[PDB]
Amino acid sequence: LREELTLESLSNVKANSYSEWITQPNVSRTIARELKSFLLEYTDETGRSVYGARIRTLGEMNSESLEVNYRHLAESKAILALFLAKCPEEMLKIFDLVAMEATELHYPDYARIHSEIHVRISDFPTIYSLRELRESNLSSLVRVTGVVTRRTGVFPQLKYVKTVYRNYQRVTLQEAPGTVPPGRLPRHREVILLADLVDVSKPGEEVEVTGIYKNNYDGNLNAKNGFPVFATIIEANSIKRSWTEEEEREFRKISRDRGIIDKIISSMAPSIYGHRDIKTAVACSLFGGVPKNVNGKHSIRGDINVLLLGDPGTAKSQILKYVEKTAHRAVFAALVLADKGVCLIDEFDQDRTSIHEAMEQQSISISKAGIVTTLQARCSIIAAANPNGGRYNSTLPLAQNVSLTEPILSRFDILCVVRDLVDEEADERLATFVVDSHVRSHPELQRQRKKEEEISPIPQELLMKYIHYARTKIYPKLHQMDMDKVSRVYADLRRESISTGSFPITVRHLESILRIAESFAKMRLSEFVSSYDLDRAIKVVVDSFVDAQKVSVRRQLRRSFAIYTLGH
Template identity: 45%
Template sequence: MVKELSEEDLHAIRELSRHPNIRERIINSICPTLSSSKQIKTAIAYSLFGGVPKGREAAAAAAHAADAAAAAAAAAAAAAGEDPKETAGQHVIRGDINVLLLGDPGLGKSQALQYVARTFPRSVSTTGKGASACGLTAGVRRDPYSGEWSLEGGALVLADEGICLIDEFDKMTEKDRVSIHEAMEQQSISISKAGIVTTLRARCAVVAAANPKFGRYIPSYTFKENVDLSDPILSRFDLICVLRDIPDADEDFALAQYVLSNHQLHHPTVSLLQQLPQQQMERLETQMKALEAHEPIDQELLQKYILYARAYCHPTFDCSLPALSSKLSSFYAKLRRRAAASGGLPLTLRHVESLLRISEANAKMRLSPTVSSLDVDFAIAAVLSSFISSQKFAVQQKLSREFARYTALATGGWATLAALLRRLLQQRLQRAALLQQQREQQQQQRLQQQRGAEAAAASGEKLLEQADIDKARRVEFTDFLRLASQHKFSGYQVEQWLASKTFKAHFSLIEVEDNCKVLVSNSWRREAPSQTTAA
C-alpha cells in the first residue's frame, strides 16, 4: 500500500505534517461520526500510529543465523552421537500500542473498532463471545486426504504487522484470555500440538472493547470491582479508557443537535430541501462545524498519512537520558503510590514502556525524526487520563488538581481553553459575591447604629457599582494568555480558538476603555452597550 503512493500523495503528506497543530487535527479526524469521546479518539490514534519496535531486525537476523548454525550443530552432534545445544534468543520490545475501551453501552466503542477496520488495511476483526483460544491464536487441522496435520493461524496471527480488533472482550472465558498473554506482550504464539512444535509471529496491536461486569460502570465501586478481567491481561494494555455515560444537559443537547444535523444534512429528501429555507440550512451546517474542534482531514489522505508514518518514520529520543529518566521515574513512582492506595487501575513496569511507545506515536503524528519533551508530556497525560478515569469521583478530583498540567494536555485543544476561561470568569464572580457579602454586613452594622432618615438613606445605597459588576463579568485578555501559556498552549493555538465558531458561540473578545481587550460571556455582553467587538 505504501509503495502505491504517488508523488502527489507524498507532497500532500509532507504539507500536512507541517501544520502547527497536526496532532489535534489527526485526533479530531479519527472516527468523525463520534462527535465527542476525545479519550477514545486519542487512544485509537496512538494505536494506529504505534511506537518503534526495538530489536526486531536484530532478532530476525539472529534467528536466521541461529537456524543455520543450529542445523550445522545438529548435524555435527548427530554424527558425534551428542545432543544438540540450545541457542540464546534476542530480546525484542514491541512497538504496537494495545488499547482497551471499557465502559457503559452506547458510547461508541464498537463504532470505533469498525472505524479502525475500515481505515487500516491490515486489520482483523473478531468477537470475544464467538472466538475460542484456537480462533485467536492458532490451531492444527488434519488434512482429510493426506492425513497430515497442518497449522491454521487465528486472528492474532492473521493480523501480523497490523491490528487485531476484539469486540465484547469481557464475554471471553478466562481460559481463552490467558491464551493471548504471550501474543500481547512477546508478540509470538508458541504451538505444541499433534507433533508440531513451532512459534508463530503475532506482531500486532490489540484494540478491544468491553462492558463492565454489571452492565454499567458503578462509580461507587472500585475499578477491580467493576471489571471481570485479571491483572495480567490488564497490565498488557498500554491504555485503558474507562467511559461513563454521565447525564449532562449541555453535552446531551449538543449531541442531540449533532445527530439531527447529520440526519438532515446527509440524508435529505427533495421535499425536505424544498421546505427548509436557506437560513435554516446554513444554521444546521454551522451547528455541525461548531462541534468540530479543528478542521478534519480527508479520510483517504489520513489513511495514507498513517501508513507512511508507520513505514518510514522511526523517531528517536532527543532529550537527555538523565532528564527523561528523572521525569518518567518520578511520575511512575508517584502514580504507582496513588494506585496502591486507591484500588484503581493496576500499574506495573510495563507502563513505563507504554510511556515510551506513546511518546514515539506522538512524534510519528508530526513525522518527526526525534521525540521531543512535549511528546513525553503528552504520553504522560494519556497514561494519567487512563488512570484517573478508573478512579472514584473524589479521587479523580484530587488527582486532577495534583496533575493539573498533564490533565490539561489530555483534555487538549479548544475544550481546555474554554474550561480555563470559564474558570477565570467563575473566580471573578466569586470574588464579586464575596465583596458584596462584606458590604452587606457593613451596611447592616450601619443600619443598626442609625435611625430615621439616615437609616432610609443608608438602605438606598448601592452595594456594588455597575462598573464593579461589569469588571466581575470579564477577563483581561493578557491574563488569559498568561494562564494558557502556563498550560502549554501556544499563541497560535489561542488565536485559532478565538477565530473559531465554537468560541464565538459562547464568548466574545471586546475592547473597553484605554484600548484594553477583555473576554466576556455572550450571555452578559448585552449588559455592556458601550463596548465594541475587537477585530
C-alpha cells in the same frame, strides 16, 4: 497454400461453423499475419506504441505473460475481436504464436529464458454473476466476479500425453453477498489455475475472473440424478482484484503546519460526536511506536494496545467499524490474520487464555500429537467491554467493574472508561448532530464535495495514504536531554503512589510513555521525539492510571498530579 485472403474476404464465414473456418490453413495464416500487423502498429494518440513498450518490459522482469486490452483489439480489425469472443480456445493458440515472434523481435534468443508466452485478455465488455450462466455460454469467453471460498495447494501436472510439467491449482468461487437477491442462497463455481496464475489470490478475497466456460462427462452425476447431465468448470485466462513525489510534498506541507496532531485527531471517526480521548487513543494505536530489542536480556514491542469500558450505546461498536474501514489490515471479533495489523474486539475461558498468551508473547507456538510449529501475532489490540452488567460504578476501582485478570490491566498500554453522563446542553448537541447526520445521509458532484468538506477537516483518502506512508517510512527516536526529567517524574509518581497507599506505578507504564511519545512523533512525520510529545504521553498515561483508582485515592492523586495532568 501460397495465396492469402484479404481482411474483407474474412467478412463471410464460408464453412458450416466458426471453429471449422478458423482452423483452415489459408484462413489461419491470414489471421496470424493480421494479428502480427496489429501488435507491431497500434498507437496511443501520442504515437508511443503501447505494445512495443510492453514487450520491452516483459524481458525487463524476465516474465512469461503478455497482456492485451480487448478494447484496443475491438478498435481496429473488429472481426478478430468477434472471432475471439466466439472461439477463444483456437484464437489464443494463434495469438500466442504471434506474441513469441513479436517478443523475439526485441530480444533474440528469449526462447532460452522461457519457451512459450501466454496472452492475457483484459477489459472484456460484458459481465455475468453465477446466476446468468446457461448452456449457450459453453466454450465461450466469460467474465465473472465473486469471493474465493476455498483454495487447494499447488501441484505439478503432466503437460503432454521425454516429459514436461506445469503448475496446477483449483479455487472455489462464490457470489459476493451484495449481489445475491433477497431470500436466496449463494451459488458456487470452481476455477482451474495453471502455470503463471497459481497463488495469485488468497481465501476471503473478492476477485474478478476472465476465462473459458467448459464442461465434461461425470459418471457420478449421471448415476445420482438419473439423467444425462454434464458437469461444468471455468478455465481462467486472467485474474483481477504506492505514491508520487507530489503526495510526499503534500504530506510534508501539511506536517509543517502547526496543530497537525489535533487535526488528525479531529478527522478521526467523523460520524461520532465527542469522545475526543477515545479518538486520540485510537489514532495513537493506528500509528504506533517502533519495536526494539537487546540480546542482553530484553525486548520492547512497537504495537500499542487499548481497552475501552463502555456504558450501553456509547458509540463503541461504531468506532470499531470505522477503524475496520480505515486501517490497512485488520481482524474483527484468528491472530495470524492480524500479523503486522490491528485486532478489534467488541465484546467478551479459552478465548481469554489465548489472549493471555498473545499479550505475553509476540509470536505463538503450539504442539499437537508430537508435531511442533510456530506462528506470528505482531499486532496492536483494540478491545471494548461492558462493565460487569448494566452500569459502571465510579466509587470502585477498575477490577470490580471487569472480568479480567490483573496482568491484563498491567499490559494494556491505555485504559479508558466512557459513560452516558447527564447534561441538557450535551444532549441537545448530540440530538442536533444526530438528526443532521440522518438528513445528510438521505437517499434523496458539487453536493458530495460540500458534504465531504463539512464532514471532516482532512479528506480521509489523503489521511489513509498519510497513515500508510508514515507507517512505512518514519522511525522516530528519543532525545537524551530531557530523559533526566522523565526519570525524576517517574520516581515522583512512584513516591506519591506509595504515599497515598495506591497500587504502584511500574516500569510497564514508563515503557508505554516512551512508546506513545514515539507514536506522537510519527504522527507529524518527525524522526525526533520532543518534550511536548513526552508531555502529551505523560498526560495520557497518568490520566489513564488515575481513572483506574478508587474515589478517595482519585482525589489525592489529581490534587498532587495537577502539575502533570494539567500543567507540566
